[PDB]
Symmetry: D2
Subunit: 199 residues, 4 copies
């Protein structure tokens, strides 16, 4: 298919002072760019392996496909989850769901914060939608393992907790990065993803 690096929907500095411009420029133009490129490389090798029926070659490529393929997915969603006009709380049916499933908005933040802080190593924190049960669910994933591909849950809000997402600004203090990132969350997109899961 030939995957492409999506244009960022805002200037690299639109999220200051919560997430500085230096990070956004590295995260999009270097890190995300690397996942896409290698993903394109990986898929071409796999197409060859399928045509030859080289099952060994297919399995050796799996780690690279899940890693870079996941990277493309997770960051492509992540950018839309942030916005200079973001922050505050959601409204409408999403807020009603957060109240029902978690009790309140502040308790949801605490649990998703804890999931993101609890990730041991590199990974992501996620708010997702469980189609089968029809309710919200928090989950964490290691490295770039994607939410939907590995768990079946539909991503609504993702928090990147790889050190490159915050270290330059917040150093080892991951909890400050989590507290600041709530200021730029684009609940308008999260709502769309939530409403999309329902008929």
């Amino acid at each position: 298919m030939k995957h492409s690096l999506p244009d960022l929907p805002y200037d690299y500095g639109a999220l200051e002072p919560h997430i500085n411009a230096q990070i956004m420029q590295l995260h999009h133009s270097k890190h995300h760019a690397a996942y896409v490129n290698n993903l394109n490389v990986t898929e071409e090798k796999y197409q060859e392996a399928l045509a030859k029926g080289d099952v060994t070659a297919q399995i050796a490529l799996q780690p690279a496909l899940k890693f870079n393929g996941g990277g493309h997915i997770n960051h492509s969603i992540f950018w839309t989850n942030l916005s200079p006009n973001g922050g505050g709380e959601p409204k409408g049916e999403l807020l009603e769901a957060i109240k029902r499933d978690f009790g309140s908005f502040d308790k949801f933040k605490e649990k998703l914060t804890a999931a993101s802080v609890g990730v041991q190593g590199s990974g992501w924190g996620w708010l997702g939608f469980n189609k089968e049960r029809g309710h919200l669910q928090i989950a964490a994933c290691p490295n770039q393992d994607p939410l939907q591909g590995t768990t079946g849950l539909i991503p609504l809000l993702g928090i990147d907790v790889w050190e490159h997402a915050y270290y330059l600004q917040y150093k080892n203090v991951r909890p400050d990065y989590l507290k600041a990132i709530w200021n730029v969350i684009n609940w308008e997109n999260v709502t769309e993803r939530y409403m999309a899961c329902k008929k």
Copy 2:
């Protein structure tokens, strides 16, 4: 190119009393057949996903491809590793390599036996060839994960220690199964795989 269940090179009862016909008949005609057929199904689903660039669908299918693809691979080699004319010890350059890398033939047996008994759950014990280092190496693998695809080693001799491989005859006592199987090892084939990697 569709994958097919290979014919067994000997009668189902050619390995009695070491491995009874009921095991060999179920192991080949029931267990192996299902991995192959399902692999063909998975490869069709995967090819569809690759053509659309659906990275989510590709990642969700990986387990079924590694499991059944590995199952097809592992059993296809396993059958060639056994023969009614087998047993005894190898000769030639293979025996010289086993002496050099493991000390003696009896020490290699202890090491591969120990690795195979050590599998916690289902898996396989393997003697393999490390191309980069140019020597023999034993490894164990879980479920139907294939050796070469996950480790880079070239499979020479595989021991299936899934319970369906022996339970009917030896029940829970895997060490009795391991003791019996050495009498039907096709050292003529193991040598062929070994000499092929060297040049």
Copy 3:
């Protein structure tokens, strides 16, 4: 406090024709006994390592502790989940919860059956209780990994799908074993575990 193999609450043949006596006799007196004894051995080695602060020795032993410790746990619950007076459906608050969380009793069976058949390799299928969310949840676990220790869910009903649990009687056809086992499920005990978590 040393761990001990619990006595089976019924004769080895009390579950015929659903689970023959030969399976029950091997499963309890051979398989379960080994996990317990080895667990006692592992705990002694681990206690020695902890007292010396040998973190290396502690980490190297973790697999043996999770495997045999889980094996002891899982089987000790499994035996209580079966009874010759079992079968049929549950009643009371447990049945109401199954209807609310899964739709109906027949839908819960399909979901737990599907989860148990889906185990690739050895493992267990579980119905569990999520304390935080306060509802039922199905999960599968590999090898002898215990439910509560790895997921936080309280085990209510476990289905052992290790091949030694059924192969002698049903051979490779796990769906026949799953079909038969529902007739001996001790819904009286499953309820007791459920009501204990609620207050």
Copy 4:
């Protein structure tokens, strides 16, 4: 036992300009300090669980013990592997082993460099000693999984490739950090670790 943060054997800035002082101060006083403290917390909970025979509690703590316990080990070794007087190449029996097992010193650097660059996520690159085979071996480990505890190999040289080890200075360009770190390698310690493995 009560583990303690070892004093660093040199000033935070003794490795400039290869590894700046800001990193060394964060890496030792914040990151390494966190692993120790939580490790002490984890071991106390485990001592309680062993005395009560709470096997569930033991397994729930395993991730925390391997993570922080490994962190203490890996960094405690890492500091001794660097030195302001470091760099260059080793001599004596270690260099002879590197020539025999890898071909040359430059080829060893390429392979250990590649292993360190290849780590997907957080982890470590290692040169180790295989006691059984009596030769050197390169391996990578994810997160803080320790070499000896998980593979049996004796650590000789470890390369920390967690992003916090280099990002502030080298940003996303991990390969530059690897090229620079060769300038401060304390081969005097690596030799001691190597000679210790031999009688």
